[PDB]
Amino acid sequence: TAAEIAALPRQKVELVDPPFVHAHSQVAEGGPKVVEFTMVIEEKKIVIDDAGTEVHAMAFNGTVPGPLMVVHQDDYLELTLINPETNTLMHNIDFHAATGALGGGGLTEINPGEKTILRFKATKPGVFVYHCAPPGMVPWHVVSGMNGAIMVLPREGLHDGKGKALTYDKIYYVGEQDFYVPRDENGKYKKYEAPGDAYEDTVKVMRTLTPTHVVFNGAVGALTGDKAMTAAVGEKVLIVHSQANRDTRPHLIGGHGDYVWATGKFNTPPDVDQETWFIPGGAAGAAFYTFQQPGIYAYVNHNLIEAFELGAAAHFKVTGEWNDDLMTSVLAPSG
Amino acid sequence: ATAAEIAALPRQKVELVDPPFVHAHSQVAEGGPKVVEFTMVIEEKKIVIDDAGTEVHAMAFNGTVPGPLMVVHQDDYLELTLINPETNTLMHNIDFHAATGALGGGGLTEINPGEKTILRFKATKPGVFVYHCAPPGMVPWHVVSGMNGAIMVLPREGLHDGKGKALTYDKIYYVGEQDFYVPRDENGKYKKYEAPGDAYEDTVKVMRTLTPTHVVFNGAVGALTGDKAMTAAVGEKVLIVHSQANRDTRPHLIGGHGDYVWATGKFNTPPDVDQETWFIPGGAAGAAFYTFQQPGIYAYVNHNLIEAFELGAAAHFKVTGEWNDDLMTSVLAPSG
Amino acid sequence: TAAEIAALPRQKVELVDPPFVHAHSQVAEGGPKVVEFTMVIEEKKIVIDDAGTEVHAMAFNGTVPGPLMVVHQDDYLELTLINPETNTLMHNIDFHAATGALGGGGLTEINPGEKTILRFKATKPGVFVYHCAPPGMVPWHVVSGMNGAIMVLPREGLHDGKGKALTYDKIYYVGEQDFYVPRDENGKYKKYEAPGDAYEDTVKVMRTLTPTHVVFNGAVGALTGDKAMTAAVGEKVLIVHSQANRDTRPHLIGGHGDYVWATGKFNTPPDVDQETWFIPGGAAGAAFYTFQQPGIYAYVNHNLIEAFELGAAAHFKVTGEWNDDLMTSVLAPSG
Ligand SMILES: O=N[O-]
Ligand SMILES: O=N[O-]
Ligand SMILES: O=N[O-]
Ligand SMILES: [Cu+2]
Ligand SMILES: [Cu+2]
Ligand SMILES: [Cu+2]
Ligand SMILES: [Cu+2]
Ligand SMILES: [Cu+2]
Ligand SMILES: [Cu+2]
C-alpha cells in the first residue's frame, strides 16, 4: 500500500569502485528499505592496453564497469542518475533487476545537464546486469563501458541446493568488457577528438562480432600484478561476474567454483564443483569458493585466446599453508 | 505397438498457422495417444529480409521462415506429409530433433522436386525441439536458408514448474531466430542472384566466417514489430518458445524476465527461474514463461546487443493495462 | 598425512588412444589408491584435412586430444610427464580437476630433456579438461592440440538426479579441437618446417577468434569409417566431450542425450531428454544415452557450419532391429 511504501526507512549508501563492493550484510538487517544510490555519468578517454589504445568511455560513477549495488529482496532501489552538462550525449539506465519501462531505461533518459530519480522494487533475488540503453544506439553505449551489475540478496542470505547457509568472507565484482576499437590501414588503433567521431568506424568493428579487447575492470591487466584480488586459505569468496553484451566462461585457474549460480539467480539451485562456468551476454553470474591452497591464481575467460591474447585475465594472491595431500610435486622437473 | 494398434489410435488432422502464432491445441492432453497429422509443402522462394530490400532465396517449410510450430503431446505420434513441389529445384528432407532413428527422420524423407513422403514418429520426450532440413553434403546451406522450425511435445498433463505446481499459459508465441549469411559486392552492398544456385559458392564463403550478416526473428529485421508486434496484457501468462537451428542465442525480454525458463527446452529438466537473460545453444529450442506486470512496449531480443540492434534480432510486445508504481516509479523525471 | 597416502595401494594404468578409454571400473574397487599414469609429450606434424593441411601438434601421449585418464573420487592421480629431448618447447600440465599451483602447471614446467611427477587428490567427481599452459604461450599450446580430459567417477558409480544408478555398457571420449591455420595470400594453407616458425602467423589467425577447422580427434573425418564409434540397439553409451578453448554444442543426430551432465560435474544433477547440450570452452561434459534404433548416426557440434564445413562430425555405427513404433516411413519418397 501507499502509506506502507511511504513509511519504509530510507537509507543512503556510499559506493565503492569495482572490484570492491560497498558495505552490506548478507542477511537482511531489519525490514525492507528504500536503498538510495547516486551515480554521476562520466564521458572520458581511458587507456585500455600497454600500447596506449584509447576508448571514449561512458562510465556510470566514473568507472568501467559501473559499481556494484547491493540490496536485499523486496527492498526498493532508488537511484539518482546525473548527466553533467560537460557530457555531450544523452544517457539512461536499464536495470535487468527491474520490472517495467524497459528496465527503467524509458523513464531515465537524461541529456547533458539533467538528472533523474528512479525507484524500483527488487522483487527477484540474484546478480543482475544494469546498462545504459539510449534508443537507436544501445550497443554503442554498452560496449563503451556503460554497464555494471547489482546484487539482490535473499533476505536470509545465500544457501546451497539443500538450504544450508553459504556465508562468504569476501566478495569481488569482476565486470568483463568487450571493446571494438577501430584501426587504420596500417593496423594501428585510431584516436578521436570526441566520442561521436568514432561512431561509424566503431559500428563497423562491432558488426564483425569480434572484439579487439576483452578486459576486466576496464583495461588489460587491471586486476593483475599489484592489483590482484586477495584471499587466504580457508576463506570463502564470492566472485560476481557480468558481461552486458557478450558471452563469457569464467574459470579460477588452480581452483573451482564450489557453488555457481551460473544464471545468476538465487532461486535457481547453484551448480557445484565447477571447473568452468558460462555467463551469456546480458547477464551476471556468481561463484562461491573456499580457497585451499596459497599462491597466485589466475581468473580468466576460458576462451584462452580472449584471456591471454585479448586481455581477459585477473589474478588472486592467496596466503596460507600449502596442502601436500591436495597436491604435491613427487619429482620436480629434472633431466 | 503394432501398426494396427497405432492404426486403431484416433487420428486428428491439424491446420498449421504461420509463426509467431501457434495452431489450436490443449495444454493438458485430450484423451489418450493420437496420431496427429500435419502436412507441409516446401517452397523455394525469394524473401526480403530488411528495409533495404536485401533478398534471400529461402527454403521454407510451409512457405515460412521459420517453419510453423507443430504441437502434440508426449506419446502421441506425429505423422507428417512433406511435399517437395515440381517447381522446386532441390531435394529436401526433414530431421525432427524430437524423433528417434534415421537421423531424426532425415534419412527416410529425402524427396526430390515432384515427390512427397509421409513420416511418422512417436513423440516420446516432452519439450520444444528444432526440426530442419538436412540433405547430406548441403545441410548448413539449407538450414541457414531458412529451412528450419520447431515442435512442442507437451507433457500429457500440461506444463508444471520444478516443484510440480501447474503452469498454464494464457497465450503462446513461437519466435524462430535465423542467422543469414548474405554475400556482398566490392562496394559492401548485398548481392542478389537469379537462382538460389548462383548464390551457393558465395554464401558458403560467408558462412565460413561464422559471422552472419543478419540475425532476425520471423524471417526479417523488424518482422515482429509495428502492427506485427506480439501482444499481451498486465496479468497475462505468456509462453515464448524460441529456437535457433544453427547458432547460439541469448533471449531477453527488456523490462521483464523469464519467470520459468526451460533453457534446454526439455520439460523433464526443471526450469530455471527469475531469468534476466537465458541461453539456447545452436541446434535447440527453449521456452520461457512470464506473467506481465507492467503495461507499455517491450523489446524481446538476442542479448548480444550488436546482434539485436545492428543485426536484426529484436521483436516488440505491446502490453495493455495499468502501471504499477510499487514495482517502478519515476521519482524525479529527467530535469535540470 | 604423507604416511597415510604412502600406505595407500598404488596402481599403474595403461593409457589408450581416444576415442577409446583405458580399462576401469564404474564402481570403485576398494579404498582410495594412488593411480599412476605416464605420458610422453610429442611435437609432431598432423594432417587435419584431405587437402593435406598440417598442424604442428603438441600432443600428450602422441594424440590430439591427449588420452582420458579415469580415477575415482578421492583417489590420487599421479602423473609422470615426460618432455623428450626431441621436443623444442617447454611444456607443463594444468588439470582442471586439481586444486593448487594453477592446476599443477606451476609445478610441472619441463624443458626438452626433462620430466616431473605430479600427484593430486581427485576431490571432485566429474569430467575435467587438462591442458598445457606455459606462461605467455598458453592459448598457442592449447590450440595446437595440447589438451585432453580425465574422468573422476563417484566411488559408487554414476547415478541420475534421483539417485538411481546409471551404468554404461560403453564409453567414448570425443576431444574437440579448434585449429587456426595460416593461409598464404592465395587462400592456401601454409606449411612450416618447425613449430616456432608458425607462431607469429598462427597468433594472427587466433586473434580473429575464427577457427579454420573445428575437428574431433585431431582431423576432419577422424571418427568416421575405420574409427566410427560402435554400439548396439539396447546399449547404454557415455559420450565424454571436451573443448579446452572454445564453446561447443554436441548433438547426436537421430538420438538424444538421455542424461547430460552439461557442466561435466557429477554432483550437479544431469539435464534429461537433451537434443543439443552446451559445453563452454574450457570444460568437459558427458552424455548418457541408450540406443533404440539401428543405423549410422552422426554426432556433431550443432553449429552446422562448424560440423559440416569446418569438420566437427563423427559417426556411430549401431547394430540392432529397427523399431517401427518409434519411427516409420508411412509413405517412402515417391510421386
Ligand atoms: O585453467 N586455465 O587455463
Ligand atoms: O535489456 N536489453 O538491453
Ligand atoms: O541433428 N543434426 O543437424
Ligand atoms: Cu550511455
Ligand atoms: Cu539489457
Ligand atoms: Cu532443404
Ligand atoms: Cu539438427
Ligand atoms: Cu605445451
Ligand atoms: Cu584451463
B84: Cβ contacts below 8 Å, ≥ 6 apart: B42, B91, B92, B111, B112, B113, B114, B115, B116
Residue A207 CB coordination number (10 Å)? 17
**With an 8 Å Cβ cutoff, is B293 touching chain A?**
yes
Domains of chain A from N-terminus onward: 7-154 (2.60.40.420), 155-321 (2.60.40.420)
* B301, B176 contact by CB (below 8 A): no
Four-residue CA torsion sign, A54, A55, A56, A59: negative
Please report how many Cα atoms fall inside a 13 Å half-sphere around the Cα of residue B160, on the Cβ side. 13
Residue with cell 509495428: B226
DSSP C35: E
| Entry field: residues in chain B | 336
Four-residue CA torsion sign, B159, B164, B170, B174: negative
Residue A321 CB coordination number (10 Å)? 11
Q: Which three cell numbers stand for residue A282?
A: 546480458
CA distance A115 to B330: 11
CA distance B167 to B298: 23
Q: Coil, helix or strand for C22?
A: coil
Q: Using a CB cutoff of 8 Å and minimum separation of 24, what contacts does C14-18 make?
A: C15/C39, C15/C61, C15/C67, C15/C69, C16/C67, C17/C61, C17/C62, C17/C63, C17/C67, C18/C63, C18/C65, C18/C67, C18/C68, C18/C148, C18/C173, C18/C174, C18/C175, C18/C217
Asked about C324 being catalytic, the answer comes back as no
Strands C236-243 and C283-290: antiparallel
CA distance C229 to B214: 37
Q: Is B104 in the pocket of ligand 3 (CB under 6 A)?
A: yes
CA distance B147 to B38: 17
The Å distance, Cα C115 to ligand 2 centre, comes to 52
Which of these, A176, A181, A177, A178, lies nearest to A205 by C-alpha position? A181
Q: How was this structure determined?
A: X-ray
Which of these, A96, A97, A68, lies nearest to A238 by C-alpha position? A68
Residue C162 to residues C165, C270, C271: CA-CA distances in angstroms? 9, 10, 12
Which of these, C99, C148, C277, B329, lies nearest to A273 by C-alpha position? C99
Q: Which three cell numbers stand for residue A92?
A: 539512461
Omega into B85 within 30° of 0, i.e. cis? no
Exposure string of B2-40, with b = 16+ CB inside 10 Å and e = fewer, is eeeebeeeeeeebebebbbebeebebebeeebbbbbbbb
Q: Looking at CA atoms only, how far is residue B183 from chain C in angstroms?
A: 16
Q: Looking at CA atoms only, how far is residue A93 from chain B in angstroms?
A: 11
Residue type at C8 in one-letter notation = L
Please report how many Cα atoms fall inside a 13 Å half-sphere around the Cα of residue A43, on the Cβ side. 20
Task: Round the CA-based radius of gyration of chain C to a whole number and report it.
Answer: 20
Q: Coil, helix or strand for C205?
A: helix
Strand order of the sheet with strand B258-262? B214-217, B171-180, B237-244, B284-291, B258-262, B272-275
CA distance B84 to C9: 66
- Torsion from C-alpha of A214, A219, A220, A225, nearest 10 degrees: -140
Chain C partners within 8 Å of B92 (Cβ): none
Report how far Cα C100 is from the mean position of its chain's Cα atoms: 22
User: A56 a known binding residue?
Assistant: no
Q: Which three cell numbers stand for residue A85?
A: 552538462
User: A302 a known binding residue?
Assistant: yes
* C237, C172 contact by CB (below 8 A): yes
Residue C209 falls in which region: left (phi positive, over 0), alpha (psi -120 to 50) or beta: left
Which of these, C305, C302, C303, C299, lies nearest to C287 by C-alpha position? C299
Inter-chain residue contact B335 with A123, CB threshold 8 Å: no
Q: Which three cell numbers stand for residue B25?
A: 491445441
Which of these, B46, B23, B40, B48, lies nearest to B96 by C-alpha position? B40
Report how far Cα B317 is from the mean position of its chain's Cα atoms: 17
Nearest atom, ligand 2, residue B254 CA: 1
**With an 8 Å Cβ cutoff, is C256 touching chain A?**
no
The CA-based angle C43-C49-C54, given to 5 degrees, is: 30
Omega into C18 within 30° of 0, i.e. cis? no
Of residues C58, C69, C132, C206, which has the active-site annotation? Answer: C132
**With an 8 Å Cβ cutoff, is C277 touching chain B?**
yes
Residue with cell 568493428: A205
H helix runs in chain B, sequence order: 3-7, 139-143, 196-207, 305-306
Report how far Cα B79 is from the mean position of its chain's Cα atoms: 19
H helix runs in C71-176, sequence order: 138-142
CA distance B288 to B293: 15
CA distance C91 to C132: 6
Residue by residue, DSSP assigns C281-309 as TTEEEEEEEE--S-EEEEEEESSHHHHHT
Residue type at A159 in one-letter notation = H
CA distance C106 to C7: 27
* A75, A157 contact by CB (below 8 A): no
CA distance B281 to C306: 13
Q: Which value in Å is the resolution of this experimental model?
A: 1.8
Task: Round the CA-based radius of gyration of chain A to a whole number and report it.
Answer: 20
The CA-based angle A328-A329-A334, given to 5 degrees, is: 180
Four-residue CA torsion sign, C71, A274, B165, C257: negative
CA distance A145 to A323: 40
Which of these, B59, B243, B75, lies nearest to B151 by C-alpha position? B243
- Phi, psi for B64 (deg, rounded to 5): -125, 160
CA distance B39 to B21: 17
Containing B317, the helix (H) or strand (E) segment is: strand B314-320
Which of these, A149, A166, A105, lies nearest to B277 by C-alpha position? A149
* B23, B71 contact by CB (below 8 A): yes
User: C22 a known binding residue?
Assistant: no
Residue with cell 516420446: B124
* C73, A273 contact by CB (below 8 A): no
Q: Coil, helix or strand for A297?
A: strand
H helix runs in B132-195, sequence order: 139-143
Exposure string of B292-328, with b = 16+ CB inside 10 Å and e = fewer, is bbbbbebbbbbbbbbbbbbbbbbbbbbbeeeeeebbb
Asked about C24 being catalytic, the answer comes back as no
- Phi, psi for C174 (deg, rounded to 5): -105, 110
- Phi, psi for C188 (deg, rounded to 5): -90, 135
CA distance A98 to A126: 12
DSSP B2: -
Q: Coil, helix or strand for B147?
A: coil
* A18, A229 contact by CB (below 8 A): no
Omega into B251 within 30° of 0, i.e. cis? no
Strands B314-320 and B230-233: parallel
* C256, B243 contact by CB (below 8 A): no
Exposure string of C202-224, with b = 16+ CB inside 10 Å and e = fewer, is bbebbbebbbbbbbbbbbbbbbb
Ligand nearest to C-alpha C102:
1
A26: Cβ contacts below 8 Å, ≥ 6 apart: A153, A157, A158, A167, A168
Residue of minimum CA distance from atom 1 in ligand 3 = C253
* B167, B159 contact by CB (below 8 A): yes
DSSP B8: T
C112: Cβ contacts below 8 Å, ≥ 6 apart: C83, C84, C85, C86, C87, C88, C89, C90
Q: Which three cell numbers stand for residue C45?
A: 606434424
End-to-end CA distance of chain A: 77
Residue type at C28 in one-letter notation = A
Residue B85 to residues B18, B44, B80, B115, C335: CA-CA distances in angstroms? 19, 9, 16, 7, 10
Q: Is A103 in the pocket of ligand 2 (CB under 6 A)?
A: yes
Report how far Cα A222 is from the mean position of its chain's Cα atoms: 13
Residue type at B257 in one-letter notation = H
Residue B236 CB coordination number (10 Å)? 17
β-sheet bridge partners, residue A279? A248
Q: Looking at CA atoms only, how far is residue A273 from chain C in angstroms?
A: 6
Please report how many Cα atoms fall inside a 13 Å half-sphere around the Cα of residue A216, on the Cβ side. 29
Inter-chain residue contact B334 with A108, CB threshold 8 Å: yes
CA distance C68 to B294: 52
Q: Among partner residues C251, C306, C334, which is closest to B116 by beta-carbon distance?
A: C334
Residue by residue, DSSP assigns B15-34 as ----TTS-----SB--SS--
Asked about B277 being catalytic, the answer comes back as yes
Largest Cα–Cα distance in chain B?
Answer: 78
Residue type at C288 in one-letter notation = F
β-sheet bridge partners, residue C111? none
CA distance B131 to B285: 10
CA distance A253 to A248: 15
User: B147 a known binding residue?
Assistant: yes
Residue A152 falls in which region: left (phi positive, over 0), alpha (psi -120 to 50) or beta: beta
CA distance C59 to C45: 10
Residue C85 CB coordination number (10 Å)? 10
CA distance B95 to C257: 16
Strands B284-291 and B258-262: antiparallel
Of residues C56, C72, C96, C256, which has the active-site annotation? Answer: C96
Which of these, B154, B166, B81, lies nearest to B115 by C-alpha position? B81
Four-residue CA torsion sign, A253, A258, A261, A266: negative
Of residues B97, B214, B257, B316, which has the active-site annotation? Answer: B97
Q: Is A66 in the pocket of ligand 2 (CB under 6 A)?
A: no
**With an 8 Å Cβ cutoff, is C277 touching chain A?**
no
Please report how many Cα atoms fall inside a 13 Å half-sphere around the Cα of residue B239, on the Cβ side. 25
Q: Which three cell numbers stand for residue C259?
A: 542424461
DSSP A264: S
